[PDB]
């Protein structure tokens, strides 16, 4: 129903916020690894 869809959407969006945070952290480290690779 209406409330089930609305509430589950809110819970999905909270997980998605954490997901984006981890994507940011992961990409930042990938870029660091690439930079260190160039120093070799």
């Amino acid at each position, epitope marked *: 129903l209406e409330e089930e869809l609305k509430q589950l959407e809110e819970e999905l969006q909270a997980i998605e*916020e954490q997901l984006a*945070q981890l994507q*940011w952290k992961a*990409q*930042a480290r990938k870029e660091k690894l690439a*930079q260190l690779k160039e120093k070799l």
Partner: nanobody
Amino acid sequence: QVQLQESGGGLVQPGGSLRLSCIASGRTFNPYGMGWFRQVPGKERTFVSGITWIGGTTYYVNSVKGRFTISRDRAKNTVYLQMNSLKPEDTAVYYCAADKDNTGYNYWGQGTQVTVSS
């Protein structure tokens, strides 16, 4: 050993805009990335946007896509959040963050209040 100081908050009508800034100073500082989080009373801080320090790659949560833009300047160790098309539900304390090591904890500033009230 690094301090983070925000600026740019305030009170706008729905549809308005604000530009948040955050400057890092102290011991020499080269983070993995910086970002912005937000918090409403009684809840935990939630991610809003982040930028990688080397590449400048940006990330946004779905509720601000197409309205907010993050950027950074390595010369001044400063990160910015341009907040357009503001809505009442964006009302929160916005916090600046630095991803500096692998402890799982970021370094934070002291927050800036953003109020969107019709």
